[model samples]
Target: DWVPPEVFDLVAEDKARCMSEHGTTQAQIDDVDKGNLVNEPSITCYMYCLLEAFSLVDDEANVDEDIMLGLLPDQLQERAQSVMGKCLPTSGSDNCNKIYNLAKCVQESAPDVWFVI
Candidate 1:
């Protein structure tokens, strides 16, 4: 008897509709019970999928710095620069710096779309 107002109103409407139809049937209950609600994919899953897709792109095409430079627009290059600036590693190690630079180059070179794949 102490149902939430919104839920109560919704149930009341459903009940009224059911009475007008043929009353609450087993089919409707079964349909509701069988529904499988799923959540949207996480960012990590998206990133993994993107990376996997890019791997296929890498295999099918020759992707050098020049190729990337030609593919990316000026605006996208600037945006990549901004992102790199924020994520740059703080460590002073030469190896880390080299790895970071390589990553930066790859990031800068990414194509806008996977035309090859």
Candidate 2:
């Protein structure tokens, strides 16, 4: 997994809260980690929730690319940055949809780069 083990504990509370808020099941989240995303708001909003919680993205769902790269371990940074280059300046009908689009774009470019906390 690209996510460092320590990162999971660090985000556990936020992750739980986001999951609760979005009605997102562990299975849906697991699906995303496997790059099997759907356009459902439950999953998409949960994605936005986590990204916003971490400040990786701002109010309008625009990614702060540098901050996002900083969250990754060094080994994945270059590939993540490249994917962000194509996927960022995120756009869609709403925040959740924006994250959905961004997630899809990133998955297409580098599937292994995405991981849940």
Q: What CA root-mean-square deviation does each model show from the true structure? A: 21.3, 1.1
- Give one digit per residue, the lDDT tens place, for model 1 in 1-117: 222356445445444443344333444333322331112122212222232333411322222344444444665666545544553432323332333333334344443321110
TM-scores for every candidate against the unseen true structure: 0.25, 0.94
Quote the positional error of residue 63 for candidate 2 in Å. Answer: 0.5
lDDT of 1 at 109: 45
Summarize candidate 2's per-residue lDDT along 58-106 as a digit string, tens digits. 9999898889877777888878777877887899999999999998998
Clashing pairs in 2: none
Candidate models: Cα lDDT each: 0.34, 0.87
| lDDT leader | 2
The candidate that achieves the highest TM-score relative to the unseen native structure = 2
Clashes of 1: 0
TM-score of predicted model 2? 0.94
lDDT of 2 at 110: 80
